[PDB]
Design a protein that fits this description.
It comes from Homo sapiens (Human). Its EC number is 3.1.4.-. One of its GO terms (biological process) is DNA repair. The structure is a monomer. By secondary structure, the protein is α+β, with helices and mostly antiparallel strands. It folds into two domains: 1-190, Endonuclease, Chain A (2-Layer Sandwich), CATH 3.30.870.10; 191-441, Endonuclease, Chain A (2-Layer Sandwich). The chain has ten helices and 19 strands. The protein has helices spanning 24-27, 47-53, 71-81, 158-167, 172-182, 210-221, 251-259, 278-282, 298-301, 353-356, and strands at residues 5-7, 35-41, 63-67, 87-91, 105-110, 114-119, 134-137, 192-196, 199-202, 233-236, 271-274, 311-312, 329-334, 340-347, 358-360, 365-368, 372-377, 387-389, 403-404. The strands form three sheets. Strands 8, 10, 11, 12, 13, 14, 17, 18 and 19 form a nine-stranded mixed sheet that branches. It has a seven-stranded mixed sheet with strand order 1-7-6-5-2-3-4, sandwiched between helices. The chain has a three-stranded antiparallel sheet with strand order 9-16-15. Helix 7 (251-259) links the parallel strand 10 (233-236) and strand 11. Helix 4 (158-167) packs antiparallel against helix 5 (172-182) and helix 6 runs parallel beside helix 7. The longest helix has 12 residues, at 210-221. The N and C termini lie far apart (44 Å).
Length: 441
Amino acid sequence: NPFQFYLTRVSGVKPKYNSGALHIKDILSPLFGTLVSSAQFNYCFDVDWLVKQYPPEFRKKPILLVHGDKREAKAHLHAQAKPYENISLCQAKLDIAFGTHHTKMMLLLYEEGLRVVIHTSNLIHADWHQKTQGIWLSPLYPRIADGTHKSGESPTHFKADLISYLMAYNAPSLKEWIDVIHKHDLSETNVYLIGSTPGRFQGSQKDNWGHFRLKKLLKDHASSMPNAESWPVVGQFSSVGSLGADESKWLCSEFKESMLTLGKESSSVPLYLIYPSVENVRTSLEGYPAGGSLPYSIQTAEKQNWLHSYFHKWSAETSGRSNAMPHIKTYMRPSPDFSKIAWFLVTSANLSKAAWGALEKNGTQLMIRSYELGVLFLPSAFGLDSFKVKQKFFAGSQEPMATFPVPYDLPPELYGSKDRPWIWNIPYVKAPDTHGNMWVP
């Protein structure tokens, strides 16, 4: 299939729902390539666990961990890695307050070429065990021969855009990876990179990152259709930032405005937000502890009760994952009957200004606090005008190159009047979870 979009394996679902899913041990297997070295960009690391996911024959190859931890957290990560002489660390600079290094990416250098993996899971056992997580696997990119001058660039500009993302760190260990990427041919890549890096972007730079980057790609590489105003926007995420006292402050002004862009020309567009309810979490495979990875605080939520009228339950019968709580984040533009989509984005970015950017200085500057990274699937990059939605995620549909695997059910289902968004720091003592426990933070 052309999309190379996968879910992680879920322990406890029937095998038909894991056939075609990937565990981290599969990604790092010798079948994917003969590993020389690797870089693991992430937020949270269990180093003992991570080294054990590499094949035994590859466990002494150099590994670079790219993280954003400071102070005692930084010391803790260094102490985790100290037993492993082959592990180096790169601390990503976070010079704006309340930012984090959230990007989840593997750079895998092999004897045979290079691969890039952009995904949504932390490098801890629980993120790969019973959660819904998303992975994009690049092609095996071959080396460009010594002495040959060619760009190695794709029609989506992925090579230059990945180098641009790594340049933003201003880090010597990542300049080494930039030089690796320069030496490989990434021309087969059919996705667009959408990154966030921390900073204040004006002028020539405003469209490089965050939601203005999305807007620019949709302006330039998508077409508007008649009745575009009836094509909804769907956003699906595992954490919610402080969005302001009403929808006009950010969500339905600048964020929705970027998401509804199509084509170059100059709003009643429905907006569906998918976020687990308390009942989704209680009845999940993990039970209430799944909610330790859904970090919405009561202090934030009680400032924006207007937001919850946009919320829809998690449901994923299409992939057998209704009880596997989502840590994937996705954004997409379905048709009014949800049978087609104009584009699909899988990313680390949750529904927050820190991740997507907030306009400042009278709309001339986009300020971003965090590192995030995702890949955008546009029909034009596949010779198509729209994607047909795959009816069953792991099924064999008659036109796989035209048929996009959406991992959750459409249309999304609105919360009922008794439902509440999962809020992780209040107790739930009315009904026990699948393991027989309550939640008492």
